[PDB]
Amino acid sequence: ADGMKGAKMYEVVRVGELGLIGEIIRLEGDKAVIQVYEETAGVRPGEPVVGTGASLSVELGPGLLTSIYDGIQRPLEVIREKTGDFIARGVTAPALPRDKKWHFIPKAKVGDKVVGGDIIGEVPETSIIVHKIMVPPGIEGEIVEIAEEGDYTIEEVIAKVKTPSGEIKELKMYQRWPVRVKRPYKEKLPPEVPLITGQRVIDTFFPQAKGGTAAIPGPFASGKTVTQHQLAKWSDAQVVIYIGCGERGNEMTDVLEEFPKLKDPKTGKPLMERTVLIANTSNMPVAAREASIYTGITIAEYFRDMGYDVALMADSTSRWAEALREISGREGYPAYLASKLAEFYERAGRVVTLGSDYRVGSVSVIGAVSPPGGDFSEPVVQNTLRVVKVFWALDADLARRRHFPAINWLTSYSLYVDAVKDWWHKNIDPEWKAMRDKAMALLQKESELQEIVRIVGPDALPERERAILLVARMLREDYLQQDAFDEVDTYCPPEKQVTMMRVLLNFYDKTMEAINRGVPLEEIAKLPVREEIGRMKFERDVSKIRSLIDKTNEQFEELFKKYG
Numbered sequence: 001a002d003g004m005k006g007a008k009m010y011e012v013v014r015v016g017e018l019g020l021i022g023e024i025i026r027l028e029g030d031k032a033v034i035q036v037y038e039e040t041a042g043v044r045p046g047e048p049v050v051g052t053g054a055s056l057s058v059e060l061g062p063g064l065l066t067s068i069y070d071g072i073q074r075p076l077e078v079i080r081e082k083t084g085d086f087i088a089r090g091v092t093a094p095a096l097p098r099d100k101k102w103h104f105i106p107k108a109k110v111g112d113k114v115v116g117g118d119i120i121g122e123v124p125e126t127s128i129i130v131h132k133i134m135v136p137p138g139i140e141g142e143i144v145e146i147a148e149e150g151d152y153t154i155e156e157v158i159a160k161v162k163t164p165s166g167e168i169k170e171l172k173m174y175q176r177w178p179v180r181v182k183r184p185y186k187e188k189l190p191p192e193v194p195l196i197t198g199q200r201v202i203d204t205f206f207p208q209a210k211g212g213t214a215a216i217p218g219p220f221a222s223g224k225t226v227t228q229h230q231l232a233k234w235s236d237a238q239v240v241i242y243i244g245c246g247e248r249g250n251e252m253t254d255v256l257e258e259f260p261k262l263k264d265p266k267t268g269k270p271l272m273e274r275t276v277l278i279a280n281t282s283n284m285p286v287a288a289r290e291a292s293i294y295t296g297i298t299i300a301e302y303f304r305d306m307g308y309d310v311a312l313m314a315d316s317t318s319r320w321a322e323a324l325r326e327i328s329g330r331e332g333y334p335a336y337l338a339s340k341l342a343e344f345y346e347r348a349g350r351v352v353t354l355g356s357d358y359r360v361g362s363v364s365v366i367g368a369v370s371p372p373g374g375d376f377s378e379p380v381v382q383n384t385l386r387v388v389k390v391f392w393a394l395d396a397d398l399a400r401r402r403h404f405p406a407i408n409w410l411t412s413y414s415l416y417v418d419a420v421k422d423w424w425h426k427n428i429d430p431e432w433k434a435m436r437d438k439a440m441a442l443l444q445k446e447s448e449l450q451e452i453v454r455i456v457g458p459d460a461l462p463e464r465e466r467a468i469l470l471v472a473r474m475l476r477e478d479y480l481q482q483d484a485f486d487e488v489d490t491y492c493p494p495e496k497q498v499t500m501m502r503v504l505l506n507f508y509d510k511t512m513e514a515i516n517r518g519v520p521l522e523e524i525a526k527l528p529v530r531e532e533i534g535r536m537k538f539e540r541d542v543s544k545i546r547s548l549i550d551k552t553n554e555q556f557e558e559l560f561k562k563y564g
Contacts, residue, residue: 003286005285006020006021006288007287008020008287009028010041012040013035018033020052021287022050023092028051029052030054030055030056031051032055032180037049037051056072056178056180057177057178058176058295059094059096060176060302061131062125062174063096063174064096064276065275065276066275067276068278069095069279070279071288071292072288073095074090074091084249084250085253086252087283088279096154097154101151101153102173103124104122104123104151104152104173105149106120106121108120113140114135114139114143114161115140115354116134116138116140117137117353117355117359119134120134120143120146126269127267127273128267128274129273132306134305134354134355135171136171137184139163139169141161141163145160157172158173159171177302180291182297183298183305184354185353185354186351186354188349188351189211189352189360191211191212191350191389192350192423194209195212196235197231197234197235198490198493199230199231199482199492200479201409201482203492204439204501205414206412206413207414208366208416209350209416210350211348211351212348212364212390213345213367213387213388213389214364214366214389214392215367215368215369216366216367216370216392217394218368222399224315224370227394228315231366232275232313234490235311237311237362238303239276239308239309239311240271240274241278241303241313242275242277242278243278243293244280244368245279245281245316246280246319247316252279259275260272265491280292280320292316293344294344297348300363304361304362304363307359307360310362310363310364311364312348312363313368314368315370321371338382345387367388389416390412390413390415390416391411391413392407392412393411395407404484417433424494429498431502432498438505439479439501442471442472443472443476449468449469450469463520464512464515466521467511467515470525471507471508474504474534477534478537493542496545500537503552507530510556511524529552532551533552536548
């Protein structure tokens with residue numbers, strides 16, 4: 001029975017674990033399981049129960065973008081005198097500006113048959129995103145009335161729907177949805193299309209699928225911020241929903257000050273215009289932090305319902321991982337996570353959306369797992385955890401050797417390689433999967449050789465093996481390592497990735513061929529083309545990169561004719 005500011009509840013008669021953040025002297029309505037009003041909930045002064053009919057929900061409409069909110073959709077409120085300068089918690093207010101005049105364009109006409117998910121209108125919310133106005137789930141029937149091409153505010157009725165029962169349902173530019181019931185769809189499609197991040201190591205060796213689940217185990221100082229920001233801005237989604245902001249004391253400060261300056265490199269316009277932030281801080285309660293991921297996923301699901309690909313990005317381990325007094329009859333702590341965290345991840349996916357038209361959207365999840373409390377086994381991983389399908393394992397040792405991104409290629413993995421190979425095969429390069437497999441086998445071989453060498457030295461290493469170490473190094477330096485700060489290498493298109501790969505694998509073939517014909521490895525190592533390959537990541541013209549294959553072959557010919 002602990003807590004001071006708006007939190008959850010504590011039983012009543014049967015299966016009770018559900019309450020509400022209620023203010024204006026106690027208004028703890030929203031019940032996830034219904035009951036016959038006030039019974040057993042009094043602990044402190046007075047304490048009655050005034051329950052409402054509504055559930056723990058979220059407003060979904062034009063006004064989400066650019067907004068910051070908290071665990072439950074309520075706006076910023078900036079306060080002075082703390083860490084950096086700004087400290088903020090959730091203040092009870094309209095989840096969306098009621099004042100704002102939004103521009104409605106009709107996409108339906110009187111007489112049209114509509115179903116849940118049908119797009120009836122459009123509003124340009126920002127200069128990047130077009131907000132699609134959809135019939136709420138579970139409403140079908142005929143369009144009897146519809147607003148004209150005009151400038152309205154959130155609460156206005158833009159359409160009337162006559163259901164087949166005869167009942168008239170009133171529709172506005174927004175809708176409500178219970179944060180903890182997954183928004184419906186026609187069909188969850190199997191993982192098939194990759195979410196192109198533009199990061200070579202990720203797209204090639206540890207790919208994410210649109211609608212897939214990814215985790216980033218983050219040791220302190222591994223370039224976690226950089227990778228996070230790279231993913232957010234380049235990755236193949238139209239909309240980003242971001243949850244965190246309070247893992248460092250001044251994280252809220254930098255979020256408040258820097259975010260509006262950040263630009264979307266795809267359009268030049270500000271990145272905030274396609275983002276919805278959800279802040280989780282140490283000052284903010286607890287209930288608005290347990291419920292935060294559901295608020296996030298619901299808004300993410302809402303944008304995918306429009307036919308968008310959405311990236312749900314979480315980077316708030318500590319604030320989220322707070323425990324609570326649960327003394328009662330019962331099902332264990334590592335099982336209180338295992339129930340909900342699994343259901344949260346179960347809500348990721350690429351879907352055929354609701355609607356009379358065939359339409360697809362997705363929600364992909366990248367969750368940062370960085371603990372200040374040592375290990376990440378039972379504390380923040382124990383579960384079947386097979387629900388997360390890709391791990392990008394950031395690595396401090398790699399970071400201090402200055403290999404970036406510091407993604408450990410031996411302990412990361414992706415179970416989406418077979419799922420996405422066909423897209424790469426059909427759209428970009430028939431040999432993609434064969435090429436990553438080969439490159440991986442070679443990285444894997446390097447790893448064993450370095451262990452052996454460590455134990456016995458490099459003195460007696462044969463030419464074949466030294467060649468494998470040479471080429472493996474070119475793979476690490478020329479391909480895995482990528483420069484987020486460079487104007488060209490901050491993004492690597494699919495077409496560039498496979499070309500760079502082919503250049504490298506060709507050099508390998510030719511290298512082993514040469515050893516095979518008695519050419520010394522030193523002579524191969526000084527080959528001029530070798531260092532041009534070192535710089536191809538900075539080249540923007542893919543054909544100039546491609547020409548390196550012929551250039552390589554030619555130079556090996558100059559080596560062959562001077563031996564055999």
